[PDB]
């Protein structure tokens, strides 16, 4: 009832979240897949007609959707901002996140590692946004976050010194600005260490980029199955159309060919339907990624667990093949200690409540401290508000509330 | 023509494939019709251009 | 007929243990367990912080603690009756089955 | 223009929201379903195609997803915390939930 | 064809369940593990716990 | 537009023979005996389903 | 007959004081402004 644990230390933690944004765009030529080069089959296919067109329309819709998904996640900046040539940012090192000029790609080191890790009438259509263009959009977002904080998301970019921005984020999580300024060197070192660990962690674990790999693998498996289905007879005498034509009379041959055509159309339909369901899943992930980009990269999120585990400070976007990696910087309380706690302090027959803190007792003295970090302060009229009388409150403890005015009045 | 080199088949080669009837222009504009691989087409005639992501801006940090 | 139902990896008892862990942390550690290691806090003080979050001063919670506790207990009692009385509330789960 | 309404009392309300998290995991034996126990039709089924493998893969994916869904919703705690033996919490009764 | 129809329907149902599970996970973090300032995300009225 | 297009596609699909002599069922029944007709009708029914 | 400052979600009337109010500008610009006394905590101590 009377014990509280207040953290006396903090850890800056960077966590990586990998979200798929796009899937491979595919186009199928119905005539090529179903009939190959056989003119006779093409004439027979015309009777079915609209089925081929419908399949093409569905695939085309998926492809345009994928371009839209990439645009929604990355094209949130109307101008390509360029980071200033000086790279000193209050002792925080952004070399891993920021683009490298020496590389021809101009991708960041973490982006380069991610890029390396990821590995019949059916054609794969190139994405409209090239990887270099996506990287350029990412660079613009990073430059805005580092130099202008959250202003760029909500309006024209407003320059702010990076330590000051970090202090504002600390205020967002309920920690006072002084903590950041007093411990700036430590916070910078912790952040730098975390970024280095991130590079090692992604490299060490193959499953880290597994979600992206899974999307690629599923698309490959579906295409392979479709190609394999061409071999299947479907109850016809032979898979090859020419063999059926050569070995059978024209009426019977037409019946057998019809069986092959229908089976192949069914195979394409199954592929298209599965792709539509997968596309819906990818779209949901892309919408989530866009929401994360706005809420975490472009602002500080008060939502719990939306942007990493711990009290979110800032997030950095990194492009990955067919996906986005978010590096989430969070404030983690550490080194908790146990202190006696009282709801109110009774002074002069009045009940005093902490304005923005919790009353804590070392054992012989009572202090008011911010909940997130332990910064004991003398109880004073300034830090407390008086409501009611001592009797109503339960657990109230008698102690003296100092008045700043009284010493001056005495003098 | 998708996946076909221009020699094989106002001619420009793009990763998507050969484009005929559109003249490539160095100047970049917002995308109107998406050919793919960063190349977009508009009616000015028909022109193919690399899409401009945005106007470049330099942020000031002090 | 070749149609088989595969057992869930997590048994209901195991799920209940996970739920119990969440309840224990929330009652004793408040919101700290979600954001980090569990930090002990008295439940009335936790409620006072929550009152501050909604924009009502903590004094209201402390002064009216008995009333608030009685109202909470009454509401919890009502929930069991409400769920039993109306089948529709659990309808979504039943619909899946 | 000059009038406001300020609440003079409060009500604590507990409401129930029910969300489905998992669905039944099922697997199908393609041969048994279509061919029963007849060997001859099984051979014919082999001729029709590899659809059975595709169906099995899809169903297996659903099953794994259901386990993942439960893990995401419930396994958010690193350690299994245990409630204190003396259940007194400022006059709040958690007996029904606990 | 009957088996294929069953599988397709199950996939669509699974997508709906997955969305509900994602919402449930979001609620567990936002409502159970913290106080939520979003309106109507965790009950009518001002969310406490 | 999507709803209109889907309905139009179904109406268009009615024209397709699906390997039968004619799209019209009555023509098949009028011109063929019950055994041959059953095979042709089966093809139409399966395609429409 | 009297003017008080209260929290929005619960009625807890409090005397208007310098501590609970911030002073910006002059009376003319604001529309709907009313004239009431604002108590100063320092003044009674100063009088004593
Ligand atoms: C909390 O419990 C202790 C015994 O563990 C008791 O002495 C104390 O009075 C209780 N506090 C309140 C506020 O009920
Ligand atoms: C408020 O509205 C009344 C009419 O209902 C009007 O006479 C009065 O001037 C208004 N006051 C202000 C401050 O606009």
Looking up tokens 């890029």 gives A115
Q: Which residue of A has its CA nearest to B1?
A: A125
- B55-58 and A79-82: which strand pairing? parallel
Length of chain A (residues): 411
Q: In chain G, which residues have their Cβ closer than 8 Å to the Cβ of D6?
A: 6, 8, 10-11
Contact state of E19 with A277 under an 8 Å Cβ cutoff: no
Residue D88 CA to ligand 1 center (angstroms) comes to 8
Q: Return the bridge partners of C5, or none.
A: D26
Contact state of B38 with A129 under an 8 Å Cβ cutoff: yes
How many Cβ atoms sit within 10 Å of the Cβ of residue F22? Answer: 14
Q: Give the separation between CA E21 and CA A290, rounded to whole angstroms.
A: 20
Contact state of A67 with B34 under an 8 Å Cβ cutoff: yes
Whole-Å CA distances, A220 to A27, A123, A321, D54, F32: 14, 12, 15, 13, 47
Length of chain E (residues): 49
Contact state of A310 with C36 under an 8 Å Cβ cutoff: yes
Residue C95 CA to ligand 1 center (angstroms) comes to 47
Whole-Å CA distances, A99 to A15, A142, A328, D15, E37: 20, 9, 18, 50, 37
Please, which residues have CB within 8 angstroms of residue B36's CB and are 6 or more apart in sequence?
A125, A126, A127, A128, B14, B15, B16
Per DSSP, chain A holds a count of helices (H) and strands (E) of: 13, 13
Contact state of A89 with B15 under an 8 Å Cβ cutoff: no
This structure's resolution (Å) is: 2.6
Q: Is A272 helix (H, G, I), strand (E, B) or coil?
A: helix
Contact (CB, 8 A) for B24 and B17: no
- A366-369 and B23-24: which strand pairing? unpaired
Contact (CB, 8 A) for D69 and C9: no
Contact (CB, 8 A) for A342 and A361: yes
Q: Which residue of A80, A83, A88, A106 to mutate against B (max B Cβ within 10 Å)?
A: A80
Phi and psi, residue D55, nearest 5°:
-65, -45
Most distant CA atoms of chain F, gap in Å: 43
The H-or-E segment that residue A353 falls in is strand A350-354
Neighbours of chain G (3+ CB pairs under 8 A): A, C, D
The H-or-E segment that residue C80 falls in is helix C65-85
Contact (CB, 8 A) for D77 and C20: no
The H-or-E segment that residue A398 falls in is strand A397-398
Which residue spans within A44-139 are E strands per DSSP? 79-82, 122-125
Contact (CB, 8 A) for B21 and B43: no
Contact state of D17 with E48 under an 8 Å Cβ cutoff: no
Whole-Å CA distances, G20 to A145, F40, G5: 36, 89, 8
Contact state of G12 with C54 under an 8 Å Cβ cutoff: no
Q: What is the DSSP letter of A100?
A: P
Looking up tokens 């019809």 gives A258
Q: Which three-class secondary structure string do you get for B1-62?
A: CECCCCCCCCEEECCCEEEECCEECCCCCCCCEEEECCEEEEECCEEEEECCCCEEEECCCC
C39–A contact, CB cutoff 8 A: yes
Residue G32 CA to ligand 2 center (angstroms) comes to 9
Residue among B54, B38, B60, B51 nearest A80 (CA)? B54
Q: In chain C, which residues have their Cβ closer than 8 Å to the Cβ of E37?
A: 53
Taking the CA of residue G31 as reference, the ligand 2 atom at the shortest distance is 13
Residues preceding gaps in chain F (C to N > 2.5 Å): none
Residue G4 CA to ligand 2 center (angstroms) comes to 21
Neighbours of chain B (3+ CB pairs under 8 A): A
D1–G contact, CB cutoff 8 A: yes
Residue among A166, A128, A96 nearest A318 (CA)? A96
Long-range contacts of A235-240 (CB under 8 A, 24+ apart): A235/A259, A235/A263, A235/D44, A235/D47, A235/D48, A236/A260, A236/A263
F23–A contact, CB cutoff 8 A: no
Residue among A325, A306, A303 nearest A316 (CA)? A325
Distance from CA of B10 to the nearest CA of A (A): 22
Q: In chain E, which residues have their Cβ closer than 8 Å to the Cβ of A280?
A: 15
How many Cβ atoms sit within 10 Å of the Cβ of residue C79? Answer: 15
Q: In chain B, which residues have their Cβ closer than 8 Å to the Cβ of A75?
A: 53
Torsion on CA atoms C65, C71, C72, C76, rounded to nearest 10:
160
Q: Which residue of A has its CA nearest to E1?
A: A266
Distance from CA of A160 to the nearest CA of B (A): 7
Contact state of A255 with F12 under an 8 Å Cβ cutoff: no
Q: Which residue of A has its CA nearest to B15?
A: A126
- b/e code A253-291 from CB counts within 10 Å (16+ = b): bbebbbbbbbbbbbbbebbbbbbbebbbbbbebbebbbe
Q: Is A177 helix (H, G, I), strand (E, B) or coil?
A: helix
Q: Give the separation between CA G29 and CA D24, rounded to whole angstroms.
A: 67
Contact state of D14 with C79 under an 8 Å Cβ cutoff: yes
Q: What is the secondary structure of C31-62 as a DSSP string?
A: THHHHSS-----HHHHHHHHHHHHT--HHHHH
Q: Which token pair is G30? A: 């604001």
Q: Give the separation between CA F28 and CA F21, rounded to whole angstroms.
A: 7
G12–C contact, CB cutoff 8 A: yes
Burial environment of residue F2 by CB neighbours within 10 A (0 to 12, 13 to 18, 19 or more):
exposed
Q: In chain A, which residues have their Cβ closer than 8 Å to the Cβ of F13?
A: 50-51
Residue nearest to atom 1 of ligand 1 (CA): A1
Q: Which token pair is A300? A: 């500080």
D18–E contact, CB cutoff 8 A: no
Q: Return the bridge partners of A28, or none.
A: A122
Q: In chain C, which residues have their Cβ closer than 8 Å to the Cβ of E46?
A: 54-55
Contact state of E24 with D21 under an 8 Å Cβ cutoff: yes
Q: Give the separation between CA F32 and CA F43, rounded to whole angstroms.
A: 15
Q: Give the separation between CA A356 and CA B37, rounded to whole angstroms.
A: 55
C21–D contact, CB cutoff 8 A: yes
Taking the CA of residue C44 as reference, the ligand 1 atom at the shortest distance is 13
Please, which residues have CB within 8 angstroms of residue A233's CB and are 6 or more apart in sequence?
A239, A260, D47, D48
Count of alpha carbons within 13 Å of A23, Cβ hemisphere only?
30
> Is residue E43 left, alpha or beta, with left meaning phi > 0 and alpha meaning psi from -120 to 50?
left
Whole-Å CA distances, A291 to A294, A297, E24: 5, 9, 18
Contact (CB, 8 A) for A197 and A18: no
Q: Which token pair is A331? A: 């404030």
Contact (CB, 8 A) for A307 and C25: no
Whole-Å CA distances, B58 to A77, A168, A322, B54: 13, 24, 28, 12
Q: In chain D, which residues have their Cβ closer than 8 Å to the Cβ of C93?
A: 18, 20
Contact (CB, 8 A) for A36 and A260: no
Contact (CB, 8 A) for C62 and A393: yes
Residue nearest to atom 3 of ligand 2 (CA): D1
Q: Give the separation between CA A329 and CA A288, rounded to whole angstroms.
A: 19
Residue nearest to atom 10 of ligand 1 (CA): A1
Residue D2 CA to ligand 2 center (angstroms) comes to 8
Residue A231 Cβ < 6 Å to ligand 1: no
CA F29 and chain centroid, separation? 13
The H-or-E segment that residue A312 falls in is strand A311-320
Looking up tokens 């929604």 gives A72
Residue among A12, A11, A10 nearest A329 (CA)? A12
CA dihedral over F8, A60, A123, A323, signed as positive or negative = negative
Q: Which residue of A has its CA nearest to F18?
A: A48
Q: Give the separation between CA A350 and CA A398, rounded to whole angstroms.
A: 10
Q: Give the separation between CA A277 and CA A221, rounded to whole angstroms.
A: 15
Q: Given D2, D6, D10, which is nearest G6 (Cβ)?
A: D6
Taking the CA of residue G32 as reference, the ligand 2 atom at the shortest distance is 13
- b/e code C13-33 from CB counts within 10 Å (16+ = b): eebebbbbbbbbbbbbbbbbb
Q: Give the separation between CA A100 and CA A81, rounded to whole angstroms.
A: 16
Please, which residues have CB within 8 angstroms of residue A278's CB and are 6 or more apart in sequence?
A23, A218, A219
Contact (CB, 8 A) for A234 and A263: yes
Whole-Å CA distances, D96 to C75, C80, D66: 11, 9, 28
Contact (CB, 8 A) for A17 and A325: yes
Q: Give the separation between CA B5 and CA B12, rounded to whole angstroms.
A: 10
Length of chain F (residues): 49
Contact state of A392 with C62 under an 8 Å Cβ cutoff: yes
Phi and psi, residue B61, nearest 5°:
-120, 125
The H-or-E segment that residue C12 falls in is helix C12-29
Looking up tokens 């039944």 gives D24
Looking up tokens 């003249």 gives B23
Phi and psi, residue A18, nearest 5°:
-105, 120
Q: Return the bridge partners of A122, or none.
A: A28
- b/e code A35-58 from CB counts within 10 Å (16+ = b): beebebbeebbebbebbbebbbeb
Q: Return the bridge partners of C6, or none.
A: D25
C69–A contact, CB cutoff 8 A: no
Q: Give the separation between CA A34 and CA A263, rounded to whole angstroms.
A: 9
Neighbours of chain F (3+ CB pairs under 8 A): A
The H-or-E segment that residue C8 falls in is none
Phi and psi, residue B46, nearest 5°:
-120, 130
Taking the CA of residue D90 as reference, the ligand 1 atom at the shortest distance is 14
Q: Which token pair is C17? A: 């243990």
Contact state of B57 with A125 under an 8 Å Cβ cutoff: no
Q: Which three-class secondary structure string do you get for chain D?
A: CCCCCCCCCCCCCCCCCCCCCCCCEEEECHHHHHHCCCHHHHHHHHHHCCHHHHHHHHHHHHHHHHHHHHHHHHCCCCCCCCCCCCCCCCCCCCCCCC
Distance from CA of A295 to the nearest CA of B (A): 22
Q: What is the DSSP letter of A304?
A: S
Contact state of D17 with E4 under an 8 Å Cβ cutoff: no
Q: Which residue of E10, E30, E35 to mutate against C (max C Cβ within 10 Å)?
A: E35
Phi and psi, residue C44, nearest 5°:
-60, -40
Q: Give the separation between CA D96 and CA C72, rounded to whole angstroms.
A: 12
Please, which residues have CB within 8 angstroms of residue A281's CB and are 6 or more apart in sequence?
E15, E18
A390–C contact, CB cutoff 8 A: no
């Amino acid at each position: 009832n009377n014990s509280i644990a207040i953290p006396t230390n903090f850890t800056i933690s960077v966590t990586t979240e990998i979200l798929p944004v796009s899937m491979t765009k595919t186009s199928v030529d119905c005539t090529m897949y179903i009939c190959g080069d056989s003119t006779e089959c093409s004439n027979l296919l015309l009777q079915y007609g609209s089925f081929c067109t419908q399949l093409k329309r569905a695939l085309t819709g998926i492809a345009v959707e994928q371009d839209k998904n990439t645009q929604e996640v990355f094209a949130q900046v109307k101008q390509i901002y360029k980071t200033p040539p000086i790279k000193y940012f209050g002792g925080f090192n952004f070399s891993q996140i920021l683009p490298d000029p020496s590389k021809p790609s101009k991708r960041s080191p973490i982006e380069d590692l991610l890029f390396n890790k990821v590995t019949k009438g059916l054609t794969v259509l190139p994405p409209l946004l090239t990887d270099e263009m996506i990287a350029q959009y990412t660079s613009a977002l990073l430059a805005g976050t580092i130099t202008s904080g959250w202003t760029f998301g909500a309006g024209p970019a407003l320059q702010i010194p990076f330590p000051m921005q970090m202090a504002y984020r600390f205020n967002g999580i309920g920690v006072t600005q002084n903590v950041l300024y007093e411990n700036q060197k430590l916070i910078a070192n912790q952040f730098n260490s975390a970024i280095g660990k991130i590079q090692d962690s992604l490299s060490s674990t193959p499953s880290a980029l597994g979600k992206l790999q899974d999307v690629v693998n599923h698309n490959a498996q579906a295409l392979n199955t479709l190609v394999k289905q061409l071999s299947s007879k479907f109850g016809a005498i032979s898979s090859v159309l020419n063999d059926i034509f050569s070995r059978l009379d024209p009426p019977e041959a037409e019946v057998q060919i019809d069986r092959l055509i229908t089976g192949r159309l069914q195979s394409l339909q199954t592929y298209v339907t599965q792709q539509l369901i997968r596309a819906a899943e990818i779209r949901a992930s892309a919408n989530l990624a866009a929401t994360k980009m706005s809420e975490c990269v472009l602002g500080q999120s008060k939502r719990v667990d939306f942007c990493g585990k711990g009290y979110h400070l800032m997030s950095f976007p990194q492009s990955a093949p067919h996906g986005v990696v978010f590096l989430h910087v969070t404030y983690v309380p550490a080194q908790e200690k146990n202190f006696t706690t009282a709801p109110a302090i009774c002074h002069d027959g009045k009940a005093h409540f902490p304005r923005e803190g919790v009353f804590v007792s070392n054992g012989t003295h009572w202090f008011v401290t911010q909940r997130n970090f332990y910064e004991p302060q003398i109880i004073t009229t300034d830090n407390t508000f008086v409501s009611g009388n001592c009797d109503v409150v339960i657990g109230i403890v008698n102690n003296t509330v100092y008045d700043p005015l009284q010493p001056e009045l005495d003098s | 023509y998708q996946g076909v080199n221009c020699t094989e088949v106002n001619v420009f080669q793009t990763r998507a494939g050969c484009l005929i009837g559109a003249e490539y222009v160095n100047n970049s504009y917002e995308c109107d019709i998406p050919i793919g691989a960063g190349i977009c087409a508009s009616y000015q005639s028909i022109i193919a251009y690399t899409m401009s992501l945005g106007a470049e801006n330099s942020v000031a940090y002090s």
